[PDB]
Scaffold this active site. Structure first.
Site, PDB file in Angstrom:
ATOM      1  N   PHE A 173       0.913  -1.254   0.017  1.00  0.00           N
ATOM      2  CA  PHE A 173       0.025   0.055   0.108  1.00  0.00           C
ATOM      3  C   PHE A 173       0.709   1.364   0.144  1.00  0.00           C
ATOM      4  O   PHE A 173       1.523   1.397   0.885  1.00  0.00           O
ATOM      5  CB  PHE A 173      -0.894   0.001   1.147  1.00  0.00           C
ATOM      6  CG  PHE A 173      -2.242   1.074   1.024  1.00  0.00           C
ATOM      7  CD1 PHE A 173      -3.278   0.277   0.979  1.00  0.00           C
ATOM      8  CD2 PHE A 173      -1.841   2.385   1.105  1.00  0.00           C
ATOM      9  CE1 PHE A 173      -4.339   1.266   0.995  1.00  0.00           C
ATOM     10  CE2 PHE A 173      -3.039   3.213   0.870  1.00  0.00           C
ATOM     11  CZ  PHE A 173      -4.064   2.673   0.993  1.00  0.00           C
ATOM     12  N   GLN A 231      -6.765  16.701   4.176  1.00  0.00           N
ATOM     13  CA  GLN A 231      -6.109  15.831   3.304  1.00  0.00           C
ATOM     14  C   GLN A 231      -7.402  15.759   2.335  1.00  0.00           C
ATOM     15  O   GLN A 231      -8.261  15.287   2.363  1.00  0.00           O
ATOM     16  CB  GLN A 231      -5.864  14.594   3.864  1.00  0.00           C
ATOM     17  CG  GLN A 231      -5.147  13.549   2.934  1.00  0.00           C
ATOM     18  CD  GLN A 231      -5.315  12.029   3.289  1.00  0.00           C
ATOM     19  OE1 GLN A 231      -5.603  11.912   4.105  1.00  0.00           O
ATOM     20  NE2 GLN A 231      -4.593  11.221   2.280  1.00  0.00           N
ATOM     21  N   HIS A 248      -8.310  14.007  -1.295  1.00  0.00           N
ATOM     22  CA  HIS A 248      -7.814  12.629  -1.773  1.00  0.00           C
ATOM     23  C   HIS A 248      -7.703  12.996  -3.493  1.00  0.00           C
ATOM     24  O   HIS A 248      -8.471  13.659  -3.824  1.00  0.00           O
ATOM     25  CB  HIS A 248      -8.904  11.371  -1.672  1.00  0.00           C
ATOM     26  CG  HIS A 248      -8.046  10.278  -1.650  1.00  0.00           C
ATOM     27  ND1 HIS A 248      -8.313   9.549  -2.737  1.00  0.00           N
ATOM     28  CD2 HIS A 248      -7.567   9.449  -0.779  1.00  0.00           C
ATOM     29  CE1 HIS A 248      -7.748   8.037  -2.517  1.00  0.00           C
ATOM     30  NE2 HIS A 248      -7.038   8.280  -1.323  1.00  0.00           N
ATOM     31  N   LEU A 268     -15.153   8.474  -3.506  1.00  0.00           N
ATOM     32  CA  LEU A 268     -13.958   8.074  -3.433  1.00  0.00           C
ATOM     33  C   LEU A 268     -13.679   6.921  -4.560  1.00  0.00           C
ATOM     34  O   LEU A 268     -14.762   6.069  -4.595  1.00  0.00           O
ATOM     35  CB  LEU A 268     -13.604   7.463  -2.286  1.00  0.00           C
ATOM     36  CG  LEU A 268     -11.877   7.450  -1.799  1.00  0.00           C
ATOM     37  CD1 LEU A 268     -11.622   8.986  -1.656  1.00  0.00           C
ATOM     38  CD2 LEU A 268     -11.857   6.794  -0.719  1.00  0.00           C
ATOM     39  N   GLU A 270     -11.658   2.183  -5.106  1.00  0.00           N
ATOM     40  CA  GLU A 270     -12.355   0.827  -5.237  1.00  0.00           C
ATOM     41  C   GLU A 270     -11.320   0.009  -5.860  1.00  0.00           C
ATOM     42  O   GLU A 270     -10.971  -1.173  -5.350  1.00  0.00           O
ATOM     43  CB  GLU A 270     -13.601   0.849  -6.064  1.00  0.00           C
ATOM     44  N   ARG A 307      -0.545  11.296  -1.216  1.00  0.00           N
ATOM     45  CA  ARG A 307      -1.913  11.837  -1.803  1.00  0.00           C
ATOM     46  C   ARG A 307      -1.931  13.248  -1.918  1.00  0.00           C
ATOM     47  O   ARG A 307      -2.327  13.860  -2.853  1.00  0.00           O
ATOM     48  CB  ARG A 307      -2.872  11.407  -0.803  1.00  0.00           C
ATOM     49  CG  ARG A 307      -3.316  10.008  -0.851  1.00  0.00           C
ATOM     50  CD  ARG A 307      -3.340   9.548  -1.971  1.00  0.00           C
ATOM     51  NE  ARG A 307      -1.993   8.708  -2.446  1.00  0.00           N
ATOM     52  CZ  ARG A 307      -1.946   7.828  -3.403  1.00  0.00           C
ATOM     53  NH1 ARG A 307      -3.175   7.882  -4.326  1.00  0.00           N
ATOM     54  NH2 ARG A 307      -0.958   7.104  -3.721  1.00  0.00           N
ATOM     55  N   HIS A 326     -11.119  15.076   2.120  1.00  0.00           N
ATOM     56  CA  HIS A 326     -11.194  13.495   2.530  1.00  0.00           C
ATOM     57  C   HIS A 326     -10.955  13.322   4.096  1.00  0.00           C
ATOM     58  O   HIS A 326     -11.879  12.698   4.718  1.00  0.00           O
ATOM     59  CB  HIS A 326     -10.062  12.479   1.836  1.00  0.00           C
ATOM     60  CG  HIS A 326     -10.046  11.211   2.199  1.00  0.00           C
ATOM     61  ND1 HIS A 326     -11.195  10.322   2.249  1.00  0.00           N
ATOM     62  CD2 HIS A 326      -9.074  10.423   2.867  1.00  0.00           C
ATOM     63  CE1 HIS A 326     -10.914   9.299   2.448  1.00  0.00           C
ATOM     64  NE2 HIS A 326      -9.429   9.358   2.877  1.00  0.00           N
ATOM     65  N   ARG A 374      -1.575  12.285   6.148  1.00  0.00           N
ATOM     66  CA  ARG A 374      -2.100  11.067   6.829  1.00  0.00           C
ATOM     67  C   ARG A 374      -1.447  10.094   5.803  1.00  0.00           C
ATOM     68  O   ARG A 374      -1.773  10.255   4.751  1.00  0.00           O
ATOM     69  CB  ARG A 374      -3.348  11.051   7.091  1.00  0.00           C
ATOM     70  CG  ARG A 374      -3.697   9.542   6.953  1.00  0.00           C
ATOM     71  CD  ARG A 374      -5.611   9.507   7.065  1.00  0.00           C
ATOM     72  NE  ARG A 374      -6.070   8.503   6.630  1.00  0.00           N
ATOM     73  CZ  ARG A 374      -6.319   8.068   5.305  1.00  0.00           C
ATOM     74  NH1 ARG A 374      -5.913   9.265   4.291  1.00  0.00           N
ATOM     75  NH2 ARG A 374      -6.887   7.162   4.796  1.00  0.00           N
TER      76      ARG A 374
END
Ligand SMILES: CCCCCCCCCCCCCCCCCC(=O)OC[C@H](COP(=O)([O-])OCC(O)COP(=O)([O-])OC[C@@H](COC(=O)CCCCCCCCCCCCCCCCC)OC(=O)CCCCCCCCCCCCCCCCC)OC(=O)CCCCCCCCCCCCCCCCC
Ligand SMILES: CCCCCCCCCCCCCCCCCC(=O)OC[C@H](COP(=O)([O-])OCC(O)COP(=O)([O-])OC[C@@H](COC(=O)CCCCCCCCCCCCCCCCC)OC(=O)CCCCCCCCCCCCCCCCC)OC(=O)CCCCCCCCCCCCCCCCC
Ligand SMILES: CCCCCCCCCCCCCCCCCC(=O)OC[C@H](COP(=O)([O-])OCC(O)COP(=O)([O-])OC[C@@H](COC(=O)CCCCCCCCCCCCCCCCC)OC(=O)CCCCCCCCCCCCCCCCC)OC(=O)CCCCCCCCCCCCCCCCC
Ligand SMILES: Cc1cc2nc3c(=O)[nH]c(=O)nc-3n(C[C@H](O)[C@H](O)[C@H](O)COP(=O)(O)OP(=O)(O)OC[C@H]3O[C@@H](n4cnc5c(N)ncnc54)[C@H](O)[C@@H]3O)c2cc1C
Ligand SMILES: CCCCCCCCCCCCCCCCCC(=O)O[C@@H](COC(=O)CCCCCCCCCCCCCCC)COP(=O)(O)OCCN
Ligand SMILES: CCCCCCCCCCCCCCCCCC(=O)O[C@@H](COC(=O)CCCCCCCCCCCCCCC)COP(=O)(O)OCCN
Ligand SMILES: CCCCCCCCCCCCCCCC(=O)OC[C@H](COP(=O)(O)O)OC(=O)CCCCCCCCCCCCCCC
Ligand code: HEM
Ligand code: HEM
Ligand code: HEM
Lengths: 123, 146, 534, 120, 122, 116
Positions: C116, C240, C242, C252, C255, C286, C307, C348
């Protein structure tokens, strides 16, 4: 207060409601008809009297209706038994439903044809 | 690298959590059915000693054994309440005894629960068929059949 | 007006709320106040993973995770709390699993992990396969597991109870938190819960932006409440945004495009992300990705969406609401996204949020339970619900020529055109004048129900008040910080001035009405080992 | 633990198995009665008497009677359980159902077992 | 994998194996007996036919085997019932087994002698 | 489970039925024409040539035997002190009841008027 409204859901729901209705139909008929058949331990004349009053055109169309009820109940009960015992049953629910719709129409038009030719030659 | 974990799933229809090591073992049937099936095998055996061995004696050893048996022999024996009730009790006791015994046999030779279910269904079907056929023949018999 | 005598009282039922409730459940007489049902919480929207260095598929220790989390926050994160979070993060994931959570399993059967974002091997070498996941639906499984355990231990949930303020009792050693004044949506009756400790786990506040990614019920009320009681808020100007934001609405798009070959093609027919920031294709932070896309647009369709909020209630590591830089309010705790334990700093890192809620919700729950065991009831003032009852009555009995929908729409539109991914000085000043005008228009609004059974325009108006307060805080803080660090990014001053602004900014509410001023103090950043570098 | 344990499982299984059997029993009955030679227009006491002089048809009709009545009685038990609101109504309706079912089974079994062709 | 192992245990174990086997033998035979006897409701001649085919030497040997099955099952079942009811049963197991071995021997050789005489005189 | 509730209910319902069955039997037997002094095989044979009296007597037999057997089950349960005594007395009761029901049902079902 009581609202009245139609849910409009799956076709299996209407199959179930027909199943229930036709089953109860056959049950009540069976009560009455086991009685009138038990009339055979009384007299040949009693039995002939009654079943001759069962040979009218009204009771003939009713015979057709009861044939329809028993035939649909049998076919849909086969579908239900398959859903329950066969592990891949619930996937082919609607397939089975269309197949038994076809079988019902075939067998029932045939049965109406036969009973109808009998009623025609009898008048 | 490590050791792959053992699969606990016996078959698809079997919750693995049913054979968990630390899971409490609690009864998996109708309560007090096994007690009474056990007692039935004992009592019906006591009755079947007399019924079955007397049947075998009278059939095979009394006068000319099987070489006397035919329809007229059967029709003379079943004209008596003694032999009618004897054969009805023999049929019912023997079939329930044997069917409960084969229930036990299936239960401890069938490996899968699906096999156990379908063999118990076949057993119940065959036992019911034999019981209704024997009962029909006994109840509705007439020597003047032809 | 009922009154309940209780102990630790948790306000929220998300991940942090229900973690605190399963901790302080057996230890004391806990009540949980939720304005939703415990399973309708934002946590359930979390699609991604939850990263903790379990070292199943690969090998990795917690110091690598700590460095990743400190460099991601652009050197504003308290490295004390960062270390504590990672070290407890391993055991937090394991405790979730032992509570029954259906993680995905490895051929050997421990727990599967996948890569990730910016979770790299050691100080920027290679991805690590760190993020533990359950399915395409991880937050939903966390939420369901925590709710199942609260059902198991028979926690006392108060569902649809809008907690509207807290009663602070003043003692010679300062103020002390006593009770929570809640408004039962179902019956309209104001309840007063008397407690010894009070945990705030009320989630974030993104609904002050037009295009956002947060639930409709994420207005920000822990922040608004503790900001009205006089206590401060920490660095609220760090939102933040996104990148993947379904340019139509704001949903968002993490997915599928995240862990696949998402070709960020924009402009007319061109690719841009390496034309702007090479040395990494699209797994940059991000905020960097979002700044790139936006300044590209300034020269399936996506667009950045507000976000996450990195600010919130200032907090120690054990979960206590510190009043100023070093004091502490006795009997007041905070956990989750509303709390600012200073772990994410200025940006974050993905999958650190569910981690944070688990770790610090557990800590805050333990701490509040043990405080309630040690201490006793202090006191409470005369009928502490006077302010709340007067508030609700004033909102109800009046008629004005303004509608909450129009005020809220104008607030969100201004806050989105001005105080967004790119913000300027005159821009933020326009936003301030707009928010002042909307704050003086909010004084004369109407509600059209006046009922008391399920009143929703009432609470809609109250939430609009909260949103206006937090919007003012955000704009004034972002006008103060004259640099471009993390999610914050100014076009006047476009690079990280580390000589004056490596310090949390804190905002104190001077007045008590809506239109008031805010005093901006500072707070030093704890530093242990990772000095700034880039 | 509201009733007899494992009674619902076996009532369920009985509906399935009696359905499988009743397909053949009931549909063969309906066929042979209504669409074989003259349908109803051939039926009378002599027809019944020459049909019930056969072990095949005697056992067929007794199996049909018992399976059909227990099947229908269980189904109507379910229907009553789904439509009766008061517990007293459910009690007395289940008692009426049990009484009618028992009476019909007793009468049909008596007629089959005791039927004699030469009555007059 | 599967290994072939003879456990070589108590004689009660072989009594139980024989009990199970003879009981299942009687069960299957009884299925067939009840069918061929149901044949008595169709005609005298059909029954006479099938039983005349049950009066051959092969089926005579089979009837001796069935006598043996029923006799052993009955005797060992008496032993099992006594073990379960009589409170000194489990002590005297393995003396009941010798008793029923002797009883089986005498009753079986007497019965096979009578049946063999019947089968000779034909 | 729930066996005692249904045994209780059965005693009540079989009592309601047995009022008519047993008291009509006693009336028609003892105080109709000559009481016992008319009873013989021919009387039994012309009474059992009627579906009415055949079903009457079979219902009487079954209801009366199950009623009495349940009542004596209760009596044994209230008077037997040892569990072994209770076991063997319930077994003797079950055996005698089964034998009587089997014999009465056989006689009713199989009775033929022309026996000699
Ligand atoms: C001639 C005189 C003789 C007298 C006859 C007496 C009458 C019989 C008495 C019954 C007594 C039981 C006999 C055996 C005693 C114990 C032996 C034993 O336990 O061995 C089990 C032992 C267990 O092995 P396993 O490893 O656990 O299972 C492996 C499976 O075989 C591998 O397969 P699987 O694992 O995939 O699953 C097995 C299978 C089930 O396994 C079976 O093979 C059972 C089949 C039973 C037939 C179902 C009839 C049900 C009727 C319902 C009516 C009520 O499951 C299924 O897949 C479902 C299929 C069944 C569908 C049934 C419904 C279809 C028809 C219904 C409608 C009909 C329309 C008309 O091995 C056997 O399976 C042996 C089979 C037994 C055959 C004996 C035949 C005796 C009678 C034949 C007469 C000739
Ligand atoms: C002709 C060929 C046709 C074939 C016939 C088939 C025969 C078998 C049928 C089997 C199935 C029956 C129907 C099934 C459909 C289910 C639909 C359903 O349940 O909806 C219930 C539906 C809604 O139920 P609910 O809202 O909960 O209750 C509202 C009550 O109606 C409002 O009442 P309530 O609030 O005032 O209180 C309830 C009340 C009402 O309770 C009842 O409804 C009971 C009705 C049955 C009569 C009782 C016979 C008992 C026999 C005992 C033998 C053992 O109970 C009492 O107050 C207690 C007094 C009753 C004492 C009875 C015992 C006295 C005699 C005993 C000794 C005899 C001396 C000799 O309303 C009905 O009750 C409709 C009744 C259906 C009529 C039966 C149709 C077929 C039978 C007609 C034969 C001609
Ligand atoms: C003629 C027309 C009349 C109609 C007849 C009706 C027929 C049905 C009757 C149904 C109701 C029966 C009576 C109900 C009244 C209840 C009163 C009551 O319970 O007070 C018990 C009263 C106080 O009980 P207790 O103080 O707790 O026990 C003291 C023991 O007496 C002191 O004894 P203990 O301390 O030494 O130990 C108890 C002992 C005594 O246990 C008994 O009392 C059992 C007595 C029944 C005999 C067993 C027959 C078993 C049949 C099995 C078939 C399945 O048990 C044993 O020691 C075990 C050995 C027994 C083994 C029996 C099995 C052997 C045969 C099995 C295989 C056959 C091969 C072929 O004393 C009685 O036991 C009186 C007995 C009543 C005699 C029956 C009267 C009618 C039957 C006579 C027929 C002629
Ligand atoms: C679409 C989306 C996707 C995300 N994906 C990820 C991800 O992949 N990884 C990750 O780490 N993070 C992700 N996040 C963010 C992360 O999940 C949050 O930090 C986390 O959900 C925080 O939840 P919480 O415990 O603060 O409370 P939340 O679950 O946000 O909810 C707060 C709770 O407080 C209660 N409450 C609020 N106000 C009041 C009031 N006034 N009175 C009473 N009760 C109140 C509510 O009932 C609610 O249940 C995502 C967020 C969103 C919106
Ligand atoms: C399209 C595809 C097909 C799929 C689904 C089709 C479902 C149709 C099946 C249900 C039809 C029958 C339901 C009810 C029938 C009925 O009411 O019959 C009763 C009679 O009630 C009536 O009055 C109705 C008369 C018959 C109607 C004519 C046909 C019936 C419905 C046809 C449906 C289409 C086929 C029986 O009365 P009885 O038992 O007392 O008979 C005594 C005989 N001695
Ligand atoms: C030491 C002394 C021994 C002590 C205990 C001895 C116990 C051994 C007896 C058990 C024998 C079990 C045999 C069961 C199988 C069987 O024989 O039956 C089959 C028949 O198989 C045979 O052919 C057997 C041949 C006959 C010999 C059997 C006797 C052996 C016992 C000898 C004992 C020692 C002397 C099937 O016949 P059927 O039922 O289908 O017949 C249908 C009739 N229409
Ligand atoms: C719980 C399960 C209960 C089962 C009940 C379902 C029964 C449904 C109908 C079945 C009726 C069976 C009775 C047989 C009477 C009969 O046919 O016999 C009656 C027949 C008359 O039949 P028809 O008049 O219909 O032609 O008489 C004959 O002339 C028949 C000539 C030889 C037939 C031999 C049959 C004797 C026994 C063999 C049975 C076959 C079964 C094999 C199983 C392995
Ligand atoms: C003749 C007198 C009989 C007696 C004394 C008798 C006795 C017994 C006993 C006590 C059992 C239980 C054994 C155990 O649980 O270990 C048993 C089992 C059994 N019986 Fe009988 N029985 C007799 C006849 C029959 C008959 C006639 C049949 C079949 C028609 C039969 C079939 C069976 C079967 C199959 C078993 C199972 C064997 C086992 O599970 O080990 N028996 N018998
Ligand atoms: C005399 C003939 C029949 C009677 C009186 C009868 C009556 C009933 C009744 C009243 C029900 C209840 C319906 C419900 O609960 O919704 C039922 C269910 C059922 N019937 Fe029949 N039916 C008969 C024939 C058949 C046949 C021929 C089959 C063939 C398979 C069959 C299969 C089933 C099944 C499987 C059910 C269970 C339905 C369920 O549980 O949902 N039935 N029957
Ligand atoms: C003729 C109409 C009859 C009615 C109305 C009737 C009614 C009753 C009732 C309600 C009970 C339950 C008493 C209780 O539980 O305390 C009972 C018990 C009993 N009945 Fe009947 N009964 C009748 C005939 C018979 C017959 C024909 C027999 C035997 C063949 C019989 C034998 C018994 C016995 C032995 C008891 C046990 C008494 C007790 O446990 O206290 N009764 N009767």
């Amino acid at each position: 207060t009581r609202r009245r409204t139609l849910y409009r859901g799956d076709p299996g729901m209407w199959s179930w409601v027909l199943h229930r209705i036709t089953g109860a139909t056959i049950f009540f008929f069976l009560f009455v008809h086991v009685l009138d058949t038990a009339l055979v331990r009384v007299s040949p004349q009693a039995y002939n009297e009654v079943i001759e009053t069962y040979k009218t055109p009204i009771v003939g169309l009713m015979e057709i209706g009861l044939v329809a009820a028993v035939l649909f109940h049998a076919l849909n009960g086969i579908r239900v038994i398959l859903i329950d015992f066969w592990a891949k049953g619930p996937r082919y629910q609607r397939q089975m439903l269309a197949v038994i719709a076809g079988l019902f129409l075939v067998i029932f038009i045939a049965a109406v044809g036969v009973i109808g030719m009998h009623m025609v030659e009898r008048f | 690298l490590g050791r792959p974990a053992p699969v606990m799933e016996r078959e698809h229809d079997r919750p693995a959590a049913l054979d968990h090591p630390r899971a409490p073992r609690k009864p998996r049937g109708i309560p007090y059915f096994e007690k009474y099936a056990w007692l039935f095998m004992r009592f019906s055996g006591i009755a079947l000693v007399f019924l079955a061995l007397g049947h075998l004696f009278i059939m095979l050893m009394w006068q000319d054994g099987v070489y006397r048996i035919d329809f007229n022999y059967v029709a003379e024996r079943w004209a008596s309440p003694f032999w009618q009730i004897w054969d009805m009790a023999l049929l019912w006791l023997a079939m329930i005894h044997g069917a409960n015994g084969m229930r036990t046999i299936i239960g401890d030779y069938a490996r899968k629960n699906v096999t156990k279910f379908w063999l118990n269904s076949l057993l119940l079907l065959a036992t019911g068929f034999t019981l209704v056929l024997g009962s029909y023949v006994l109840v509705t018999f007439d020597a003047n059949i032809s | 007006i009922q009154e309940h005598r209780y102990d630790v009282v948790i306000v929220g039922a998300g991940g942090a709320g229900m973690r605190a409730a399963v901790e302080a459940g057996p230890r004391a007489r806990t009540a949980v106040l939720t304005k939703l049902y415990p399973t309708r919480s934002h946590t359930g929207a979390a699609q991604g993973g939850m990263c903790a260095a379990l070292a199943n598929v690969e090998e990795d220790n917690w110091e690598w995770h700590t460095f990743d989390t400190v460099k991601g926050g652009d050197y504003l994160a308290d490295q004390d709390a960062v270390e504590i979070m990672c070290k407890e993060a391993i055991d937090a994931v394991l405790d979730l699993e032992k509570m029954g959570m259906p993680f995905n399993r490895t051929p050997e059967g421990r727990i599967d992990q996948r890569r990730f974002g910016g979770h790299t091997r050691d100080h920027g070498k290679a991805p690590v396969r760190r993020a533990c996941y359950a399915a395409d639906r991880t937050g939903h499984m966390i939420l369901q597991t925590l709710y199942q355990n609260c059902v198991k231990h028979d926690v006392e949930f108060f569902n649809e109870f809008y907690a509207l303020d807290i009663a602070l009792t003043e003692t010679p050693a300062g103020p002390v938190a006593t009770g929570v004044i809640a408004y039962e949506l179902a019956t309209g009756d104001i309840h007063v819960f008397h407690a010894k400790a009070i945990v705030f786990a009320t989630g974030g506040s993104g609904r002050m932006y037009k295009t956002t990614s947060n639930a409709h019920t994420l207005t920000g009320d822990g922040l608004g409440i503790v900001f009205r009681k006089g206590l401060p808020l920490e660095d609220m100007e760090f939102h933040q945004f996104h990148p993947t934001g379904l340019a139509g609405l704001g949903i968002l798009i993490s997915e599928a495009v995240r862990g696949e070959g998402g070709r960020l093609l924009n402009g007319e027919g061109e690719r841009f992300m390496e034309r702007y920031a090479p040395t990494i294709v699209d797994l940059a932070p991000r905020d960097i990705v979002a700044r790139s896309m936006v300044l590209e647009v300034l020269e399936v369709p996506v667009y950045p969406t507000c976000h996450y909020v990195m600010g919130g209630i200032p907090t120690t590591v054990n979960g206590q609401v510190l009043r100023d830089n070093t004091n502490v309010i006795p009997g007041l705790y905070a956990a989750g996204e509303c709390a600012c334990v200073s772990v994410h700093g200025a940006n974050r890192l993905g999958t650190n949020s569910l981690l944070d809620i688990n770790v610090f919700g557990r800590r805050a729950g333990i701490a509040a339970a043990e405080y309630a065991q040690n201490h006793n009831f202090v006191d409470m003032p005369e009928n502490p619900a006077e302010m709340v009852v007067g508030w609700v009555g004033d909102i109800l009995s009046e008629h004005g020529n303004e509608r909450v929908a129009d005020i809220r729409g104008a607030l969100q539109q201004s806050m989105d055109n001005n105080a967004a991914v790119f913000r300027t000085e005159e821009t933020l000043k326009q936003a301030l004048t707009d928010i002042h005008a909307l704050k003086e228009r909010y004084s004369r609004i109407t509600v059209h129900d006046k009922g008391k059974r399920y009143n929703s325009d009432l609470l809609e108006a109250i939430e609009l008040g909260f949103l206006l307060e937090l919007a003012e805080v955000t704009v004034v803080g972002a006008l103060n910080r004259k640099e471009s660090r993390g999610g914050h990014a100014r076009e006047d001053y476009p690079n990280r001035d580390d000589t004056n602004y490596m310090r949390h900014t804190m905002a104190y509410k001077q007045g008590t009405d809506l239109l008031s001023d805010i005093r901006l103090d500072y707070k030093p950043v704890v530093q242990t080992r990772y000095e700034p570098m880039e």
